[PDB]
Amino acid sequence: SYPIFTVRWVAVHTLAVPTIFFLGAIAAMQFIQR
Amino acid sequence: RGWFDILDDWLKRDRFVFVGWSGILLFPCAYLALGGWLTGTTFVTSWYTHGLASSYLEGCNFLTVAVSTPANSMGHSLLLLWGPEAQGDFTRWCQLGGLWTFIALHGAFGLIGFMLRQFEIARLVGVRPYNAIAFSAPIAVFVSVFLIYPLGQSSWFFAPSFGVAAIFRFLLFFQGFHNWTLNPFHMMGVAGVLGGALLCAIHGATVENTLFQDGEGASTFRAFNPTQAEETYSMVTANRFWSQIFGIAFSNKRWLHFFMLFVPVTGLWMSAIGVVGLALNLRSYDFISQEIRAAEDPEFETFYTKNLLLNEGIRAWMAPQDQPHENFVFPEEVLPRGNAL
Amino acid sequence: ANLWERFCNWVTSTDNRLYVGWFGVIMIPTLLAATICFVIAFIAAPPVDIDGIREPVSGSLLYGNNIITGAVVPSSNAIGLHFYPIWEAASLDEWLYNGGPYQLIIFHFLLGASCYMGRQWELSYRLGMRPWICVAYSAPLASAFAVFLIYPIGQGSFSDGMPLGISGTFNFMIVFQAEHNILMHPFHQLGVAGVFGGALFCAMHGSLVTSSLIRETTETESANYGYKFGQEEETYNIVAAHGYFGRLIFQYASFNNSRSLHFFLAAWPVVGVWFTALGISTMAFNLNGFNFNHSVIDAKGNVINTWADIINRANLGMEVMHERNAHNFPLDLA
Amino acid sequence: GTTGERPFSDIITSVRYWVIHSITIPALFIAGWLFVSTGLAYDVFGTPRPDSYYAQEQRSIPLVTDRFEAKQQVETFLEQLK
Amino acid sequence: AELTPEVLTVPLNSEGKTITLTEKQYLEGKRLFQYACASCHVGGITKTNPSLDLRTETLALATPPRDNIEGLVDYMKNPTTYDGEQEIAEVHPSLRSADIFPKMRNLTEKDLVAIAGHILVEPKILGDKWGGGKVYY
Amino acid sequence: GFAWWAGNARLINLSGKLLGAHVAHAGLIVFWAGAMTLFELAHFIPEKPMYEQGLILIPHIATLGWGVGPGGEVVDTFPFFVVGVVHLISSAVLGFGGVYHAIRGPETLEEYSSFFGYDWKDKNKMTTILGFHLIVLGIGALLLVAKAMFFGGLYDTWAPGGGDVRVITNPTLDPRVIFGYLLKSPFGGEGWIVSVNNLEDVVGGHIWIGLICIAGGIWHILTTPFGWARRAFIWSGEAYLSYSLGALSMMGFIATCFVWFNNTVYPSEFYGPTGPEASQAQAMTFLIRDQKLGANVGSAQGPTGLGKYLMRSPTGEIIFGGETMRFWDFRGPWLEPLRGPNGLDLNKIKNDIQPWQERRAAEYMTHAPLGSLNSVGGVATEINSVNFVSPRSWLATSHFVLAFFFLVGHLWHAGRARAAAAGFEKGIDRESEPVLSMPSLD
Amino acid sequence: GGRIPLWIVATVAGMGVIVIVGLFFYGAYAGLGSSL
Numbered sequence A: 001s002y003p004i005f006t007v008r009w010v011a012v013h014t015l016a017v018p019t020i021f022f023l024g025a026i027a028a029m030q031f032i033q034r
Numbered sequence B: 001r002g003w004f005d006i007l008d009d010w011l012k013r014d015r016f017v018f019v020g021w022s023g024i025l026l027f028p029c030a031y032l033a034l035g036g037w038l039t040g041t042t043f044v045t046s047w048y049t050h051g052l053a054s055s056y057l058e059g060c061n062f063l064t065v066a067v068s069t070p071a072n073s074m075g076h077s078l079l080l081l082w083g084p085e086a087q088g089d090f091t092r093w094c095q096l097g098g099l100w101t102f103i104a105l106h107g108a109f110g111l112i113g114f115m116l117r118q119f120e121i122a123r124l125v126g127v128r129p130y131n132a133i134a135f136s137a138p139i140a141v142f143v144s145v146f147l148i149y150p151l152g153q154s155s156w157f158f159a160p161s162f163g164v165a166a167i168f169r170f171l172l173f174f175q176g177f178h179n180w181t182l183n184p185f186h187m188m189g190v191a192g193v194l195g196g197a198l199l200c201a202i203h204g205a206t207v208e209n210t211l212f213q214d215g216e217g218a219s220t221f222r223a224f225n226p227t228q229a230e231e232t233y234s235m236v237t238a239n240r241f242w243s244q245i246f247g248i249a250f251s252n253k254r255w256l257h258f259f260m261l262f263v264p265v266t267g268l269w270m271s272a273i274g275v276v277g278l279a280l281n282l283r284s285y286d287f288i289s290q291e292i293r294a295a296e297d298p299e300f301e302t303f304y305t306k307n308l309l310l311n312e313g314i315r316a317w318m319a320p321q322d323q324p325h326e327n328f329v330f331p332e333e334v335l336p337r338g339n340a341l
Numbered sequence C: 001a002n003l004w005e006r007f008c009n010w011v012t013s014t015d016n017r018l019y020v021g022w023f024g025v026i027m028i029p030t031l032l033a034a035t036i037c038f039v040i041a042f043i044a045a046p047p048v049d050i051d052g053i054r055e056p057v058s059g060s061l062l063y064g065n066n067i068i069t070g071a072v073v074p075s076s077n078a079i080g081l082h083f084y085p086i087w088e089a090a091s092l093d094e095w096l097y098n099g100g101p102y103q104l105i106i107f108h109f110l111l112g113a114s115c116y117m118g119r120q121w122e123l124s125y126r127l128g129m130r131p132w133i134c135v136a137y138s139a140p141l142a143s144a145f146a147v148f149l150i151y152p153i154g155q156g157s158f159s160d161g162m163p164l165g166i167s168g169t170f171n172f173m174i175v176f177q178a179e180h181n182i183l184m185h186p187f188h189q190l191g192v193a194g195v196f197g198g199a200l201f202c203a204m205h206g207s208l209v210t211s212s213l214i215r216e217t218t219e220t221e222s223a224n225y226g227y228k229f230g231q232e233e234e235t236y237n238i239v240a241a242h243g244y245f246g247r248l249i250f251q252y253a254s255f256n257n258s259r260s261l262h263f264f265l266a267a268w269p270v271v272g273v274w275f276t277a278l279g280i281s282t283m284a285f286n287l288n289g290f291n292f293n294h295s296v297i298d299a300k301g302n303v304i305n306t307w308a309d310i311i312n313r314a315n316l317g318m319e320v321m322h323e324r325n326a327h328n329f330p331l332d333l334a
Numbered sequence D: 001g002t003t004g005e006r007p008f009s010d011i012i013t014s015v016r017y018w019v020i021h022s023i024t025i026p027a028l029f030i031a032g033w034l035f036v037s038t039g040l041a042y043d044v045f046g047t048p049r050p051d052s053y054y055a056q057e058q059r060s061i062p063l064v065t066d067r068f069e070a071k072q073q074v075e076t077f078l079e080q081l082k
Numbered sequence E: 001a002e003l004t005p006e007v008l009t010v011p012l013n014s015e016g017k018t019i020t021l022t023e024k025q026y027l028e029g030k031r032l033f034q035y036a037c038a039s040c041h042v043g044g045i046t047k048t049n050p051s052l053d054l055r056t057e058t059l060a061l062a063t064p065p066r067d068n069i070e071g072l073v074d075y076m077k078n079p080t081t082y083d084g085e086q087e088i089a090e091v092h093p094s095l096r097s098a099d100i101f102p103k104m105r106n107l108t109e110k111d112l113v114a115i116a117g118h119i120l121v122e123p124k125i126l127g128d129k130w131g132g133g134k135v136y137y
Numbered sequence F: 001g002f003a004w005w006a007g008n009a010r011l012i013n014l015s016g017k018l019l020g021a022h023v024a025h026a027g028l029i030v031f032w033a034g035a036m037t038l039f040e041l042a043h044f045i046p047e048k049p050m051y052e053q054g055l056i057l058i059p060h061i062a063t064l065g066w067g068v069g070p071g072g073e074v075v076d077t078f079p080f081f082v083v084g085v086v087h088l089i090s091s092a093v094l095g096f097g098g099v100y101h102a103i104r105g106p107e108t109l110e111e112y113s114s115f116f117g118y119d120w121k122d123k124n125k126m127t128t129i130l131g132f133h134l135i136v137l138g139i140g141a142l143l144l145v146a147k148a149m150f151f152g153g154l155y156d157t158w159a160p161g162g163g164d165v166r167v168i169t170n171p172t173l174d175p176r177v178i179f180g181y182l183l184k185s186p187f188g189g190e191g192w193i194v195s196v197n198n199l200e201d202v203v204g205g206h207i208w209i210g211l212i213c214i215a216g217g218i219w220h221i222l223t224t225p226f227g228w229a230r231r232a233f234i235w236s237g238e239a240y241l242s243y244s245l246g247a248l249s250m251m252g253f254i255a256t257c258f259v260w261f262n263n264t265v266y267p268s269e270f271y272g273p274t275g276p277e278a279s280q281a282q283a284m285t286f287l288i289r290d291q292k293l294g295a296n297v298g299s300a301q302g303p304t305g306l307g308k309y310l311m312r313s314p315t316g317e318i319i320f321g322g323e324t325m326r327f328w329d330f331r332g333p334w335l336e337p338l339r340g341p342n343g344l345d346l347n348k349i350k351n352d353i354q355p356w357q358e359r360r361a362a363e364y365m366t367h368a369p370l371g372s373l374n375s376v377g378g379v380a381t382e383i384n385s386v387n388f389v390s391p392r393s394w395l396a397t398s399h400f401v402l403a404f405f406f407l408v409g410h411l412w413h414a415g416r417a418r419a420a421a422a423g424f425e426k427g428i429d430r431e432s433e434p435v436l437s438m439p440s441l442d
Numbered sequence G: 001g002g003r004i005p006l007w008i009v010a011t012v013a014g015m016g017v018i019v020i021v022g023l024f025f026y027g028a029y030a031g032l033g034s035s036l
């Protein structure tokens, strides 16, 4: 009997969600030519 | 049992991450300072404030990305999103350096929130607040360097930019212009940081090498129980070793741990004081007696005079690119140079 | 009962106010030779031609220096890595002019400090202790080896070792940055993390223990009198400390095994300073900090400066000015 | 020892967790990528593209030199590239 | 700014004919310059003789003028001193001396045009940085 | 009772599994030697100097005389291929025995055979295993002598005509020369064994070492430790490990200086110029340049009063001026033709500098062993362009790092071995704390 | 609850990090920031 949505859930996703999005953006950057 | 006491109940519940009343200040501010740094180092230029590339999007690596100070022409403007300079335009705000004040101001308020947090948790758990007190030292350093120092100068532009290489340039600036290594307040800070590092290593090793044999395993970590009353290492044998090796040793376990608090905290406070003087160009740059002798006596040379020649080279060779708003044009023939080089 | 065994018993005795030991047998004479010569030179030595260009630098107090500018000056670049004891000079005057005192001090010092490490092992053995305190001391010792011996070996001359003085130290680190870009070298970056982190953890551990002292005194006394030397029970409550610090961050970010915590306290600054000693020692062989000069260019090919290029401007200013008279040819290759 | 949340190691080894996150994680990765590859990121933040740091013959930085005319100075710099 | 055909247009000979390299040739020449020449000529200077750089204004006053594709391709085959008075194949890399400078062995005639083209385009992009030395770094 | 992170300590008294650990690990060393060579060859371009190509294994093979001809030029790459291939193949055999003895073979050996089984405290058996390995090593040293004297020779950077592969017919046997080296000072101008500057002394040294190791191998098979050795050492597996760690660390520091200073067994044609060499080359380069312009390099007074191009060492020799005065102990084949009895000879400098010496000096000054961690060649202030870090810098730095840590591991394991042997490596017995039974210091 | 073995999750996550860090190090040699 555990909850899914806690304060802890929020903190974790507040960091993890933009972290992956940013990793995608930086990945795309390696294929940019001048 | 009104609404305040109900909220107080909820803020102070034992959970994986404790919140508290200070979480209302700390968590938004800490998250926005961090979020602003990552946003800016990933996407934002310094082309209009500095003439620099500073983001991953522009080709910079982790060492060279930065969130840079605003342009010198902004003075000490708060640079609010909605203020007279950016006038609500988010894009212009980024290009004018608004992320720097955003990060620096939210950061300041986050540090307040964190210290409040140390006070709050100490009160609930029932211990003395010396961890909060020790944290005063990073606060003094933050506000003296990121707030008091540029406020004494012409603009935010001369504060530190938030980045690895940009901080390195700040170190060299302070040498060439302030001769900051010569400052007794920095020397005291250096002694405090190196002294703390020393104390940290020597206390960890002494404990680890005066352990009592409290188990049979060759891994000695298992032979400790967090509820045991007995000391896990011999203070008596440690005192004897250091007394014979070094001449003196600790004998009081509380004095030792207070001394560990005292040494780096004090060093940081001292260095903070010296930066306050540098806010006003109140440097310890020169020794007058040296200069009078050297001016009159072209054979008198010391390591002191040698370093000022180095300082003069730093100023003359970095200033045009590092202070672009001044439009310094130094023709080749005026640049200070030794032979051949 | 034999005269030699009586001497051996005194040397290794655990009852001497200061332990001597077999390592002590080498350390005491060498540290006294280095100390006495350093004091005398710091106060009275005449100017020394450190760069072999017949341009003496004044290091001693009697020759117009104060505590901050004074130094025992490195030996002449004309000597390079050649051994220069007193008995190789035609006179003490010559030996002083050419920087003899510096070689004498650093060689005796390096020997004595190496034996100091040995003596830390040795007494630990006589006292029934675990052996590894000397392993912690090897990080500062390696750092002293790097700036006094290893770096002169890589660059060909003891004149590029670190001067024995406060201003001389700064000259050494300013010249090092131009020539090697040490700020951009990851082993110096880890050294900073070892030393910043060391001071941090020192403050944390001191403040957590102090925060959880068990009440044992009145408000009119130093809490320190709550601890009696050699008492058996702990003087603070680690459960309270852990309970505070776990809630400050989160639970598993905090130590509750005091042996793990203190091993962590030892490891972090020691490993960080190993790396920084290694950074100096490998920059001795000119494997330098990262170089990102002109690494960003636009579509046409204009250079787009970064903070690394600004660092380079500062480095350039150090390069062109240091030893302003000692270079006849366009490259400063050592 | 526990405050009532579900243990992390129990979650990340649960199949339901991986059913949800094998979608959410790459979707976010793809999302950020397109933010860059469509060029949106340049326009949101005002970051020069490789061809828009200088005018063709220009050798000078477009350095903001006024406080209250700053927003308009950048706009004047930008139109000198069109 | 970008690499426009006007940028990539350089003199072919002393009679004022021009040639327009392509982006390909420019990057080809830059690669080849770094492989065969940059150990002494990084940035358009000359480490082993700083008095003589690769600036277009210096090349134009060489005898044989060398501020054009022809003069440069000739130089890489049969280099001479600045006044044209003596040949220096034995101390300067060239095709005439590829036996003693082995990196010159595999350069074809089109490689020489790209290298030459690179040397003439570059001061048009970098201005004073090309051949200026550390003052402009 | 060791934790997982100290897991390999569990093998101390399991001689079967510890054998496979050693043999499989020896497969990793031979594997890397094989693969690195094939990688280096696959990337090798013969028109470029080796030191412009980040090669460190091909230069060791070329130095043995394979693949190269006059002047150091690569003439045939098949020897490189073979050495890489044979090493790689061999690593599978060793890996095979390694994992067999680690997983399936008898967990301990002393029940299966009294020959291969050993006890660390058995001073007789230990010295016998030492003796076998001393003989193997002695054969190893003689294999180099064979190659030098009977199988095509070795590359000789000093050979007249620019360097060449030369068969060594008269190795130096005079013990006054061989052991004379071992008694030279390590300080400048002397350089201890790093000063060896001719292959006759090199080959002669290996004849002596081969014989001494074989003689010592047989001595240690036939004897047991004398009583004075018995009371002076700790006799345990960890203690022996600690001794070898000290020895490897010493060896690593010596190798570091060898590759940094020595240009005989590390020829500069393959590894690039040494530090001192490149610095001397710059002085030579501008001497040549200025003298062609009409400069009288013998009489030119520089800004300090010292000669701009030429000055005296502290013992009087004519040497190059400028900062390279510190490097006047450098000796190299492109420079030595200019040396007379008093140092550099002004009449040779004015008349006998050959174009190949001008070429070589220009080449070496522009390849000085200076560069950045990301392989930008030159001083720290140089702009991107030249991709170069000298093999001498890569080899010297890596082996200093390794040497340093193995000295730490010596301290770690020697201290522990002493404490383990005396019974207090796990901590102090509360009931019998030595200090508590000692009188107080005051 | 404990379906996917934790050591398998640790290996794939670890390989995934290596992939991305390797991509960033390849990019220091190509495109923007390469010096070419």
Ligand code: CLA
Pocket (backbone or CB within 6 Å): B024, B025, B028, B029, B032, B078, B079, B080, B081, B082, B098, B101, B102, B103, B105, B106, B109
């Ligand atoms: C407690 C959390 C917290 C704190 C302390 C701050 C603090 C700050 N923020 Mg941050 N911010 C936060 C949360 C927080 N923010 C959150 C959650 C977000 C996400 C939306 C942001 C987004 C954000 C941006 C985008 C910016 C800031 C900025 C600022 C700075 C200027 C603030 C200011 O002038 O306020 C002024 C407003 C107040 C002080 C409100 C006080 C309310 C009073 C007490 C009541 C007034 C009554 C009412 C108005 C009357 C109505 C009239 C009626 C007739 C209709 C300051 C450092 C600016 C900055 O950093 O620029 C450099 C900026 O541009 N913040």
Ligand code: CLA
Pocket (backbone or CB within 6 Å): F004, F005, F006, F007, F008, F009, F241, F245, F405, F406, F407, F408, F409, F410, F412, F413, F416
């Ligand atoms: C011939 C060399 C040699 C040998 C055979 C041993 C053997 C042993 N050592 Mg000693 N040691 C050595 C060298 C050696 N050591 C050196 C050079 C040092 C100095 C650093 C030490 C320091 C040392 C300590 C401090 C301890 C030992 C211990 C041990 C025992 C357990 C080791 C174990 O299970 O590790 C398991 C292996 C690991 C945990 C892996 C270590 C990970 C390393 C540090 C990272 C290396 C990666 C490298 C830097 C490149 C990075 C690439 C990246 C992809 C990872 C075992 C008897 C333990 C002991 O006393 O037992 C009696 C112990 O506590 N060793």
Ligand code: CLA
Pocket (backbone or CB within 6 Å): F003, F004, F005, F006, F007, F008, F009, F010, F011, F014, F017, F018, F020, F021, F022, F024, F025, F092, F095, F096, F099, F102, F103
């Ligand atoms: C040079 C590296 C090296 C080597 C050769 C060994 C070897 C060994 N270790 Mg040590 N170890 C190492 C590094 C190494 N270790 C490091 C870095 C750590 C830290 C994580 C440890 C931690 C550790 C612990 C904690 C323990 C050991 C133990 C052992 C022994 C038994 C292991 C076993 O049965 O596993 C069983 C494993 C398997 C069956 C999995 C398959 C492994 C195979 C051999 C891989 C072969 C791959 C390759 C493709 C083979 C091709 C074959 C072909 C050539 C024919 C064995 C001799 C154990 C021991 O001492 O027991 C008494 C033990 O408890 N080790």
Ligand code: CLA
Pocket (backbone or CB within 6 Å): F019, F023, F093, F094, F096, F097, F098, F100, F101, F105, F106, F109, F112, F113, F116
């Ligand atoms: C130093 C390493 C070493 C040591 C000490 C041992 C020791 C032992 N092994 Mg192991 N083994 C090794 C390496 C080693 N082996 C390697 C490399 C392999 C893979 C080929 C094996 C594969 C292996 C198997 C499959 C078995 C053993 C077995 C045994 C035991 C009996 C062997 C016997 O009677 O041979 C007596 C002597 C000989 C047969 C003569 C060998 C002469 C060799 C082949 C020539 C010398 C090689 C040369 C010097 C170096 C190579 C040259 C090259 C560079 C070109 C013994 C404990 C057996 C065992 O214990 O079973 C329970 C067993 O079944 N071993």
Ligand code: CLA
Pocket (backbone or CB within 6 Å): F127, F134, F182, F183, F212, F213, F214, F215, F216, F217, F219, F220, F223, F224, F225, F226, F229
């Ligand atoms: C891997 C090599 C190796 C190893 C580990 C050993 C190990 C051992 N040998 Mg053997 N030995 C070897 C090779 C080796 N030997 C060879 C090749 C020979 C033939 C010459 C011998 C001849 C030999 C004899 C004749 C004897 C031993 C003995 C011993 C034992 C005592 C060693 C001792 O006291 O050293 C400690 C060293 C000393 C007390 C003196 C050191 C003197 C050196 C020269 C000082 C200089 C060091 C300096 C810092 C570096 C510069 C070099 C210098 C020369 C300039 C020990 C078991 C003894 C024993 O018990 O025999 C059964 C013994 O009497 N060995």
Ligand SMILES: CC1=C(/C=C/C(C)=C/C=C/C(C)=C/C=C/C=C(C)/C=C/C=C(C)/C=C/C2=C(C)CCCC2(C)C)C(C)(C)CCC1
Pocket (backbone or CB within 6 Å): A014, A015, A018, A019, A020, A022, A023, B031, B032, B034, B035, B036, B038, B039, G017
């Ligand atoms: C500003 C702003 C804002 C905010 C924002 C934010 C909030 C953001 C966030 C963001 C984020 C939050 C981000 C993140 C990202 C991250 C990243 C980018 C990461 C990376 C990392 C990595 C890369 C790592 C790696 C590693 C290493 C190195 C080692 C170990 C392993 C690992 C893997 C860990 C708002 C809107 C309010 C409005 C105003 C403006």
Ligand SMILES: CC1=C(/C=C/C(C)=C/C=C/C(C)=C/C=C/C=C(C)/C=C/C=C(C)/C=C/C2=C(C)CCCC2(C)C)C(C)(C)CCC1
Pocket (backbone or CB within 6 Å): F020, F021, F024, F025, F027, F028, F031, F085, F088, F089, F091, F092, F094, F095, F096, F098, F099, F102
């Ligand atoms: C014990 C142990 C361990 C270890 C292991 C080891 C270390 C092993 C080794 C192994 C090895 C060491 C292996 C090797 C192998 C090899 C091989 C397998 C080979 C092959 C080869 C080939 C096949 C080749 C081919 C070719 C040719 C012939 C020619 C050219 C081309 C080529 C190259 C392709 C561990 C820690 C993990 C775990 C625990 C236990």
Ligand SMILES: CC1=C(/C=C/C(C)=C/C=C/C(C)=C/C=C/C=C(C)/C=C/C=C(C)/C=C/C2=C(C)CCCC2(C)C)C(C)(C)CCC1
Pocket (backbone or CB within 6 Å): F177, F178, F179, F181, F182, F193, F196, F201, F202, F203, F204, F205, F206, F208, F209, F232
């Ligand atoms: C090959 C060669 C050569 C030769 C070499 C040789 C001949 C070598 C030898 C070497 C040797 C012949 C070595 C020796 C060694 C020694 C040592 C290294 C020692 C050790 C010792 C110790 C470590 C001890 C310790 C101790 C003490 C002191 C006291 C008591 C305790 C004990 C015992 C622990 C030459 C150069 C010509 C050239 C090139 C090649």
Ligand SMILES: [Cl-]
Pocket (backbone or CB within 6 Å): B306, C171, C175, C321, C322, C323, C324
């Ligand atoms: Cl200087």
Ligand SMILES: [Cl-]
Pocket (backbone or CB within 6 Å): C326, C327, C328, C329, F321, F322, F323, F324
């Ligand atoms: Cl020079």
Ligand SMILES: [Fe+2]
Pocket (backbone or CB within 6 Å): B203, B257, C205, C209, C262
């Ligand atoms: Fe403690």
